[PDB]
Amino acid sequence: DSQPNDEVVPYSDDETECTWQVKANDRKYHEQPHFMNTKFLCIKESKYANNAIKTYKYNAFTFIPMNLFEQFKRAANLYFLALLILQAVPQISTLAWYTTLVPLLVVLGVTAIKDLVDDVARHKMDKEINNRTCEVIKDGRFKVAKWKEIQVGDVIRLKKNDFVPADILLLSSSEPNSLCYVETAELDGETNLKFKMSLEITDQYLQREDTLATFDGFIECEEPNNRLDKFTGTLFWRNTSFPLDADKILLRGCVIRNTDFCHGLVIFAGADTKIMKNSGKTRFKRTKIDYLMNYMVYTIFVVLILLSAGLAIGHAYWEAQVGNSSWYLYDGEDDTPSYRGFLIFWGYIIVLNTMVPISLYVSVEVIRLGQSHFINWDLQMYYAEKDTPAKARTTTLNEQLGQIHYIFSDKTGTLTQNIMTFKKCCINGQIYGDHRDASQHNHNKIEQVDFSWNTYADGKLAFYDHYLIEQIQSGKEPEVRQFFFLLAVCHTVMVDRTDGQLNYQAASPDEGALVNAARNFGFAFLARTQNTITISELGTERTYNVLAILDFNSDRKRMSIIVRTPEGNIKLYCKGADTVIYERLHRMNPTKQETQDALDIFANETLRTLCLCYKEIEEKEFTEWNKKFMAASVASTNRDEALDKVYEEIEKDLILLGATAIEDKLQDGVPETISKLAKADIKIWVLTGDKKETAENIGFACELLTEDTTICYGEDINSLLHARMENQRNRGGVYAKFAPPVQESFFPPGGNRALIITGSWLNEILLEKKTKRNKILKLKFPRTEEERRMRTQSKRRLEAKKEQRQKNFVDLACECSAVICCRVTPKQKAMVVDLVKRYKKAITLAIGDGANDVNMIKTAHIGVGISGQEGMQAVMSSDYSFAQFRYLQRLLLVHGRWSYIRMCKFLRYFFYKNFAFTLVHFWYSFFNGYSAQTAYEDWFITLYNVLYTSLPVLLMGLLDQDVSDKLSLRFPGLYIVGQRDLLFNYKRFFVSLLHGVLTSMILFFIPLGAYLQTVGQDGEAPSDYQSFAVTIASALVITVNFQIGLDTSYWTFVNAFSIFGSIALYFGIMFDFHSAGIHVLFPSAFQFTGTASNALRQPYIWLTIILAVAVCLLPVVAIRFLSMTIWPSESDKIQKHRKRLKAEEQWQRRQQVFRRGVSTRRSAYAFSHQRGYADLISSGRSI
Amino acid sequence: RGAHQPDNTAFTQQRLPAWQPLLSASIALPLFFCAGLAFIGLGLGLYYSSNGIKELEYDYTGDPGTGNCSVCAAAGQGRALPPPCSCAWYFSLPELFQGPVYLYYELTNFYQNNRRYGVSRDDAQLSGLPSALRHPVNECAPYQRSAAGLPIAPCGAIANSLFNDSFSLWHQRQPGGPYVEVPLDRSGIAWWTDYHVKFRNPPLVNGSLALAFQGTAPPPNWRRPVYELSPDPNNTGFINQDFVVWMRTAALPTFRKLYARIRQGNYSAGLPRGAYRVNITYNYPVRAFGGHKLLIFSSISWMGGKNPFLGIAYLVVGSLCILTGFVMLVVYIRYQDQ
Ligand SMILES: *[C@@H]1O[C@H](CO)[C@@H](O[C@@H]2O[C@H](CO)[C@@H](O[C@H]3O[C@H](CO[C@H]4O[C@H](CO[C@H]5O[C@H](CO)[C@@H](O)[C@H](O)[C@@H]5O)[C@@H](O)[C@H](O)[C@@H]4O)[C@@H](O)[C@H](O[C@H]4O[C@H](CO)[C@@H](O)[C@H](O)[C@@H]4O)[C@@H]3O)[C@H](O)[C@H]2NC(C)=O)[C@H](O)[C@H]1NC(C)=O
Ligand SMILES: *[C@@H]1O[C@H](CO)[C@@H](O[C@@H]2O[C@H](CO)[C@@H](O[C@H]3O[C@H](CO)[C@@H](O)[C@H](O[C@]4(O)O[C@H](CO)[C@@H](O)[C@H](O)[C@@H]4O)[C@@H]3O)[C@H](O)[C@H]2NC(C)=O)[C@H](O)[C@H]1NC(C)=O
């Protein structure tokens, strides 16, 4: 009945001594043929991977196949290729030599260049990590070398503050007993230091360079496994080989601290490290608009086929009723009418193909490249201190930024900046340090009080209570001189004074703050040799002697020490959580209610608290328990539990001293950002690998979960989900015969219900645990499982038992105000993201730094990496990378929604300018015998969507903006109209097409009505094809460019210049093609000669263009005006009332001094520290 | 300052000055009222100018039982070679035609805008290049060569199928007096650019048009070489007025083409009241596919022909414009901060 531990981070139960054989020296040993695998051709590489890192996708010579395969995921390219194949059949060509291939190649190469520039950028970003200059043993001494040339089997040397290049086995260092201190903030989000102990045998042998240049040991570790905490294996160093475990292993993303240098054997490298096994399966990301464009292309293809078939039938019928009777339409052929219709089918396909023209993915690429370059030019997204410009890395996921539903964010390094900074304390009743809290300098300014009376103050803490220091100087009360001394005695900090000035080597963030405060409030802490620690109380040195150090533990939650003063008197000093101390305190303490009622204020602030007490052990009773735990210390299997039993024997009569407070330092702008994003209907989940207690002060600090919010840990969730699932399906005691699962009866509609879940309970709820070997019978074969359709082993149906817990949990998390998952494997974060994106289909964003967020960043719809720090493992797999969390305000509420709006405007206008153009030949077909005759000039069809209408739409898709960004962050609600697909869905595409068909109808049937009868003025060329074509064409290039003026809402100078340049270019190039100048030296190329300057010279023709423009343009204005004073949209309302409105400046704290319904009784206890730092009681690891 | 701060110009930060137009209510109403009023006035002007023009037609096809030319309705053998069955028809005018008078001929059910038919021409040769005369293009496929294999001079189906009728007009002065012929100015009946830029007959070798057309056989359906189309050096060849007028194709299957205008010296006014006769020369066969042939006397104005469509369209658009103006005004007034 092993229940979830909720303290373990279950790296097990995630998968889906075995001859790895490194023998670290003589490289050529691993080059043996049998070790290395074999491939199809001579290109067989190895078994032991290299130490290089690759992130780029296009290698030297797979850029042609791989890019063109992803290039044809767009349907339009298949459309163009089909047309290319069609237009090459000789029986229907209607064209000159292959000049329809080159435009396809240009269109297909622009995207290749654009997608190669990004690859080059990341290929040079990948260079930095490979040139970090470690030190390796080449043949003799240590020599400087690059990271990329470290191979499995190399002795390496590392210095302090330097990254660990590969998975190494520590074998020596420069510390007593050769141990090392490391931190792992990029592996599992912890913030305290871990200690790795080297093997004993190598400590007393190598220790030096010359002996290090001699090694024969074998390692028989396992194969790369992605466990991060087990590493079974042995070492055949010599003469009765020695075993190994995870305590003698350093991983890759870890960094050394507080040790001058160390040595190691490389065991893994490159993509074989235990941190490179967790990031997997990079995929090809496509935005949500591409899946819409594909359906558009398919429906337009169907429409084109049907229309061409109809016109072919019409021509077939017309041919053998009036066609094969006219002596002037005579041909040398003898084609039967059905064959004539079959041939006209292809002619009409070719004529009407110019729906979805070749300039569709050349304009989208330009628009997205422009917006991407807008992102990284933003001066308001630039971090001054670390000098990072917040660049964009993909240039193809750019309109996805304005459709986000969820955000998942790591905690350590993303929301916090890893600073502790002790704030205030509560000694004997009243709290200390509000801002002045005194009578002297209480009505003065609120500046910092000096500490210019010690030799140790060193000016690093900011304190403001003049009363506390004033009293400390006065010595008017001995109740505080005792408290601040406890902070300097109850810890495991080690001091290593470099030169005179003393610095503190604290293993835990939560202990360094207290010792620093003690030191710069007097009460410094000097040497700590092995049994006696020296304290400089107000400049007077004293030396006590430690009797025992009752160490910290995870389930104890307190730490204490027993000392003896030089005055022959023993004492016990303890500190720990209030909820465990309040069962230990002596039953006479008057100031218990005073401090308890002061412990709430601290916890009502967003900060973490501890409780302090001491006990008078006298000098006699001690001895009994002293020999008692002497008897219980040295044991075989109970060192961790019998010692715990003897520990819990002097935790009685523990009179108080007071409580302390420590405050995390999230960042500048996190809570405002969270509030803004919560107004825009986005949901935030925090997925962290850090402890459970630590990821509650962050929850309260950033105001995800606040007062008046039930927390509802996973213990409750499992019971609730089991009760709702097992009962009320068709069971649950009494049958219901309905058992309706439709009502969301999970919680009553009260809102503000948080959800804090540990990784172990996350496994338990989701019905996913590893099964031990003693639960299954055998393999698959007809002996255990019989012939009756494989009734047991092939009949799993665990997906029935699953797929209901998963969906139920995802629907449970749908109605919680904030969800926080703590102590999660890197794989489980991606698991949660994929669960949320599989049911309730939504667009997801994942943000975070460090190497434990690569999986989640890759798996989400958008992956943002936090940069500016030193470790950049989450930045090279991301899509965008700024340096602060708060910049998320502008990536979404300014760039993302503008980009979505502009792309939707472009797509709405493009499929309108194209049907108004092409769909005129269809209407013309009824008047020329369905003969596939065009209604435009030959030179107008090949220049329409290249010169005449291509620039205005690009300028609108780049420069347009709805409202300025100075007040686009003031109104986050404007985001919502993009989140629900309300600007361009499938139903709107069929309205743009209807606009197109109506425009083509009214552009063809008015000039036909005017041209039914004569139009000549004095030359009398009565209604003729040339003038008709000029009239129809010149009345389209005006309406299609006045319409783009009714769409732009941000009229820059270049926009108007572009529109009128388009119109003038059309007219001024038409008057040049139709001229007597180029009729000579180009006779049979320009059909319309002298017609432009001969048809456009009469009023009747101009009175026809004006009417067509005024009819296909004026009802649009009427509709817009009639749909704006009856249903004004949100942006319309904002723009209308912008003239007079008030300013705004808010977000103080949401102060909540006290509640009239006091119910919390929840303690803000949190201590980031591990167990086993009692090495001092074994020996003095000092010098 | 800073090795990586962007440039901070106007464009790079999305700060270019820009006028923001909001579609107010003080712009919609004046537009839909002024534009409507202008459309009403302009359309009324067009409607009255399109109705003061007088036209007169005959439809001299011989298809039905009745009609003077019906006496020479043909059959399916080809009987242009026998007498051209020159018919005639008479009319009287009680009033004048003040203004110059234009004479057209109209064909119906004639698809001159068929795609295969329209492209069957050689523009390069027809321009007049001395080299391109002998080698036509493959597009004039069934009218490219001859029975003797010689190249054709026009190279087209449009030029092969040319209107070959003729008309003449006579008037009687005194009651009972014999008819007399009145002039028809058959010159300048095309665009000035067509017979000065488009079409040019090739340069004269040894100084004669005839001596520069050797080898070039006439089109199969004609009866005269291209350089013999009229006994006038200034009007002969690729620049013949009838030939150039016929080659400017029409847009719809029912078209008319200009034949002549009456503005000569004897009476530079309309046709005086009295009795007139017209002689026709029935040579073009159209009854095979169910066509028609018409003669048209008309005058002109500033707008042109006699189409009443566009004025009525303007009146309808203006009426709809003012009605939508009132509807929008009412909607605007009823909706204020609601
Ligand atoms: C005003 O313009 C009109 C234009 O419509 C003129 O009318 C046309 O005048 C043409 C003469 O220039 C005349 O063309 C030929 O008509 C007869 C041809 O018919 C013969 O063939 C028929 C079968 O049709 C098929 O025959 C050929 C070959 O066998 C096939 O390859 C092909 O598929 C055809 O479909 C038979 O049914 C007929 O009974 C007859 O046999 C002939 O008189 C002429 O043919 C020529 O033949 C040889 C070929 O080398 C010549 O050497 C010879 O000299 C003949 O000229 C003639 O070319 C059109 O029929 C006629 N009507 C139309 C087109 O509707 C008017 O003449 C013109 N009037 C003026 C200028 O005053
Ligand atoms: C209306 O529809 C009818 C029938 O559907 C059409 O009549 C057909 O005209 C075709 C055009 O020539 C005929 O094709 C064959 O014609 C002759 C017949 O012997 C044959 O020699 C042709 O072969 C050539 O095209 O002949 C030339 C002669 O020199 C060669 O040079 C050339 O290389 C080919 O060898 C051709 O195969 C067809 O026979 C005929 N239909 C019938 C039933 O006879 C009309 O043209 C259509 N249009 C109208 C009437 O306007």
Ligand SMILES: *[C@@H]1O[C@H](CO)[C@@H](O[C@@H]2O[C@H](CO)[C@@H](O)[C@H](O)[C@H]2NC(C)=O)[C@H](O)[C@H]1NC(C)=O
């Ligand atoms: C053509 O039609 C006209 C009238 O439409 C006919 O003119 C009349 O002809 C008869 C005898 O042929 C005369 O007696 C009349 O005086 C004529 N009418 C006049 C002069 O107004 C003409 O005969 C017709 N041509 C024919 C039938 O060949």
Ligand SMILES: *[C@@H]1O[C@H](CO)[C@@H](O)[C@H](O)[C@H]1NC(C)=O
């Ligand atoms: C004109 O018609 C009249 C009526 O018969 C007659 O003089 C003759 O037929 C025609 N004359 C000419 C020159 O065509």
Ligand SMILES: [Mg+2]
């Ligand atoms: Mg982190």
